[PDB]
Symmetry: D2
Subunit: 369 residues, 4 copies
């Protein structure tokens, strides 16, 4: 099965390896970046994506950050098509919305594109990293992209490509992910806990703003001690949870106050640091509810809310979701094009609509002054 | 300063490194294990510690696992003393208790404070990770010439340096949900415990158990110190740890009953042939952050065991030579050197007197449950 | 440009890097071997090639080892064509000759010129070592589905990428004295030959032979791509290569007699049970760098074999599809695309016609020596 | 028995590893450099050592380079004693001589014997390369707090651990022809010397000089300990070493004249405005392996210098505290502990008395050549 096979797997008399099947070799990040380098067009778009995100997060730009795209990418061809459509929507709304495409590769729980690119229970991580990076180089010739850092190694292969990132709810409390965020070159968002408490996300924001010293993988692929500077461009993501939804004006108000009390936002000159996820907890795992969540946020914006920095929306070419058929009944090749195999997404129609609603809300808020 | 310095730190026009100060070189796990190898005495004790833990967790042995020891070890000499005292108690109660010394190096803190033996072996606020790993591994090799030890996995890299020494382990509460630590547990050589959620719910710990029981493929650091893709087999020797939470303490018979039912519904324990997979943490949330409550919590578990409880596999207790805790003096007033011997600098622990009493209580409970 | 560029190149106030331009990333050997694995056909051919070489080197097989092929391979397509031709000759003469194709990738450049397939696969003065390793390994996996192959170890790292593929190897004359190459030889899985020194001395090759037979401990690159301390077992399957030198040619019966005596005196081959440990290079110094002389050198060795010489284990011959050599045209007037197919761009080789002839001569010499048993 | 042991050693059915016993982990150069860093004192001395060597090799400074010191260092304390004595001599003659201490760790041996400080620091036939590299680097850091040092490059990896410390270097005679060592020299930060061939001819050294002056691209070990492709700039600060050979000794005025002409013909030295690129080794072949001959060779070179010779850039002399040499006693007779202090265990050296005399002669020769 595996390249280097542990001949001693399952021998419990051994001291440390008998639950290791074996190992597969990995291209070092240096190597993968050499094979798939960035052009100047990549650099311009990625750097512009980071600057535009920071300017909103610092209250210098009155647009809204919109992280929007598939729950997870299983089909690079469909993702590039989607990027072409979103790019056009982006040019229409660039006066009001800073659109960043959601380029997530994995759903925590199918392990995702990097872990299992062939979607067949074979694990071809090295190939998956290649497929992932090449697609990201193609995506960022069109528009900036957003990522989820679920692990701490794979950012070494891909982190030059992101203009904004997020820590998964299941790892907001993880010291590993807070240290990771303190050394990334782009703003990072921290989701409230799965039980809906905001504390862990506020804690993560503060931890990530400080320098750290910690063990980590480096670009040649060896483990070293890293020193980070601290990342002050981070924000929280309201994403629902066991206590119910938290996109409403009352939850936003409690969140604004928590940020002030924690001394993260000056209440007299406030920076916007609240992103609302329209999906996941906040939609009750029903994609038809995402436009309703977005509209509620849009209404708060139109009425003068100035600390919501943006929204996250799970969106695809076609709405809904699908399971992967058995290889018996067609396998991966029998999947519908442009349709998520993880969380259900809104289709391209609701997407055009939701984007239009948000842009009007930004226009409405300008009228208020 | 740092060894390799990013001359470009803070230059935002750069694509990926401007929040990296630099790097310090790290001895690979291979190097450290070579300098501090295991003797055959080490291997015998560690393996026996693992075999005994599994036998209890598989319902093949009716003794109780007692993971007991300092909150965090800041003083390797005091820990070796404590280890000798605990070994004697271990010989006395070996008929009823499987004693495993708690060998934790750090108390996770979201706020400031001592980062632990690995990060700051000098207890002076410096970062000397290479030294700390040497100190830690050497101490563990000395400890496991006496008795088995239990470890806490807070990250996924430092286990590569130390995991050959543990007879049982636990994931920190703050990463029970983390896929990384669930993958880690699936490849370890010994049973791993997962703590209940901050809200007192078992779901995240049930999820972790099931995730850990399956094989995984993931990026990982290897003993030569390079990154590879590793494949694990899955770990079916894992268990849950009741440690309280916002709903209060959960060591009581009623909380244990709900926990048994939750495990059965999640199809983790057949309720008709039940394997004991509940470990009760007697400290932290379950003691109201008051060490004098730890013997009471233990007594309550002992009462349940004595009356026939057969799904509690063991207890965790924070125990030291002298009870309580102490702050580290300001270097103004003597620094680390002015510390009292054998007293925690993190969570308050029960002293050796309370420890002997607690162990006798639990042993009597196991004897009591046999008479039924 | 280079991938990681030393921003401080030429800053003589610095302690250690100011003559380093930079670095390019390298696939670790494990990675390259994972992408280009050996089939069972590869293994059977490679292993049989090693078994047959040893059996001749231990005097258990009365055939002749013939290492024959291009001086250096610059064109993988031509090398596969050549290998197909050489395979047929191998079936013809397998009763008498153990034919192993010469799969060398470069001619060491004391001054200037093409650095070889690994160092410069595009033959254009660009350096593309990572690509060169891929091309090299792929070609070897293709070659050894046809016939066993022989290599030259010029450096100590690139064997980590390729050494599972060779059935016999040789150390360059300019490094027979190198402790590095002697330690290297002690850990290889196949017989290794040591060439006599550039000044015509046999001592340095004899010294290397004994050094290579002992276990060693030394710094080395390993398959994951990190440097470790390796311990070897020692290689007792090594031999010397007579290749001419400043003292003139040394393929004649007189030099062969001197070499047998030196080997016996050095306690390298027991004079009472003598094993064949002499390989004659028909090119380089022994042909006066004139490819037309190689068949004459081979015939002279053949005569010695036919008259009963029993310590020559084989011959080395530089052979290509078409004889001679050619320079690389200026990119101005064509570049590599204007090279003659199947013609060396390093040392001049004999063509395919002379090759069939030389092989027939050597095979008859083995037949002749069998008749002396009467 | 080795750290990682090949379970399949000697299985000839395997494709590539059956002549490998196993592996031992190695501290990477980064780690070793972190533990034993250079102070500013080190840097000033090492850099001044390089700048003075270059100035002489470029004919901007009319002193003589004297690389002088033990054949090999087996005892770091005695070497530090020697360096302090030589430092005093260096201050006395700094007007005429640029003194660089010879800091060699091994005597190359095809034959059996002590493998040197790095391979066998304990001088007991064991292999403890990690320990040896630590001892070696720490000593070099101590030596270069006193005076610049000269090294010999026998392999291409261990220079990664030590090359920040040398102010001048040399390729071993057995690898002057080696492409690997020519590439190495093109990337080093200090002048490098190439010895004439065993047969007394200059060809291999001339070729090596020209190859080293050009940029190269090659596989190499890097400071983090991984293998990469390195690109070098070329080293035009290299020179040749006359060291005898089968044609006899080659330190005499006739041999120097032939060497001058060969360098000019090879277009390595401007024949009209000559830069000095000839270093005369007073030991080894040129002394008939008899240390008492070294001062005579030196006096002969001094005679040439005083009479106007301007293309000899320096001398190498094997010098120790006490003259001669000694074998390492067997373990039943005492072992390394029974060694005489300050006495070579490899090549015989001249002692401290001959050393002072030789240096005074050479300085007078430089003074003489100025009076001219």
């Amino acid at each position: 099965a595996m390249f280097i096979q542990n001949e001693h797997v399952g021998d419990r008399s051994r001291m440390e390896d008998w639950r290791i099947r074996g190992y597969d070799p990995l291209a070092p990040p240096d190597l993968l970046q050499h094979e798939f380098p960035l052009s100047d067009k990549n650099k311009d778009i990625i750097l512009k994506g980071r600057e535009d995100t920071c300017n909103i997060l610092n209250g210098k730009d009155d647009r809204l950050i919109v992280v929007i795209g598939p729950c997870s990418i299983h089909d690079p061809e469909a993702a590039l098509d989607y990027a072409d459509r979103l790019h056009k929507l982006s040019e229409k709304h660039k006066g009001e919305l800073h659109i960043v495409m959601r380029a997530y590769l994995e759903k925590p729980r199918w392990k995702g594109l990097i872990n299992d690119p062939d979607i067949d229970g074979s694990f071809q991580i090295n190939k998956g990293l290649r497929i992932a990076r090449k697609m990201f180089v193609q995506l960022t010739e069109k528009l900036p992209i957003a990522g989820e850092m679920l692990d701490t190694i794979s950012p070494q292969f891909l982190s030059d490509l992101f203009s904004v990132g997020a820590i998964g709810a299941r790892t907001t409390e993880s010291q590993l992910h807070r240290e990771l965020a303190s050394g990334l070159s782009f703003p990072v968002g921290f989701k409230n806990g799965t039980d809906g408490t905001l504390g862990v996300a506020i804690d993560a924001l503060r931890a990530a703003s400080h320098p750290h010293h910690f063990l980590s993988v480096t670009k040649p692929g060896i483990v070293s001690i890293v020193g980070t500077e601290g990342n002050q461009d981070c924000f929280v993501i309201l994403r629902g949870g066991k206590q119910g939804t938290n996109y409403d004006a009352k939850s936003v108000k409690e969140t604004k106050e928590a940020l002030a009390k924690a001394k993260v936002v000056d209440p007299e000159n406030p920076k916007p640091r609240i992103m609302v996820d329209c999906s996941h907890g906040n939609s009750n795992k029903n994609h038809k509810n995402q436009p309703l969540v977005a509209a509620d946020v849009a209404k708060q914006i139109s009425e003068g809310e100035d600390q919501i920095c943006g929204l996250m929306i799970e969106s695809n070419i076609n709405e809904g979701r699908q399971d992967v058929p058995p290889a018996d009944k067609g396998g991966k090749e029998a999947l519908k094009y442009g349709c998520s195999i993880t969380d259900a997404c809104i289709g391209i129609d609701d997407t055009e609509s939701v984007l239009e609603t948000l842009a009007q809300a930004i226009k409405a808020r300008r009228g208020l002054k």
